Structure 1
Amino acid sequence: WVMMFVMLLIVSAVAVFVFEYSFTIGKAIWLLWGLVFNNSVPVQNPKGTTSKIMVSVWAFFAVIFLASYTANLAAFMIQ
């Protein structure tokens, strides 16, 4: 969890200087964090192609992980 948080910060900074070449820092952190948790929170998406490509893989990461966790947590009930 803690390394996920620190890599979230790293990826936020990556998106920061990718967009450098009204989306600078806080909004972007909030968006990424929101994206992990089932995309519940309304956001303000960026309008850069490279930023979209960067967000897609994170999306992928989020989808894989959430799936693991539910499944894994089901094992405790069944054992």
Structure 2
Amino acid sequence: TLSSAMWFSWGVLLNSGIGEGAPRSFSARILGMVWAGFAMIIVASYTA
């Protein structure tokens, strides 16, 4: 999961429906979780 993971993360950066896989561990869970958190906090900060 090298190409699909980067595709999913970089789509999440743009809040896009790119990347449909789910985390295979709670560690990947929290990692993608905080990544998406920072992504949307940045987009909210910029719109404001």
Instruction: Name the TM tier (shorter chain).
Output: 0.7 to 0.9
| TM-score scaled by length of structure 2 | 0.78
Match for residue 47 of structure 1?
24
| TM-score scaled by length of structure 1 | 0.53
Q: Is structure 2 residue 41 aligned with structure 1 residue 61? A: no
Q: Which amino acid aligns with 1:30?
A: W
**Over residues 36-56 of structure 1, what are the superposed CA-to-partner deviations in whole Å (9 max), with x where a residue is unaligned?**
112332422232111001111
Q: Higher RCO, 1 or 2 (CA under 8 Å, sep at least 6)?
A: 2
Runs of 5+ in structure 1 lacking a partner? 1-22, 72-79
Kindly name which structure, 1 or 2, has the bigger radius of gyration based on alpha carbons. Answer: 1
- 2:13–2:39 CA contact under 8 A, matched in 1: yes
Displacement after TM superposition at 1:59 (Å) = 1.2
State the aligned residue count. Answer: 48
Match for residue 30 of structure 1?
7
More helix by percentage? 1
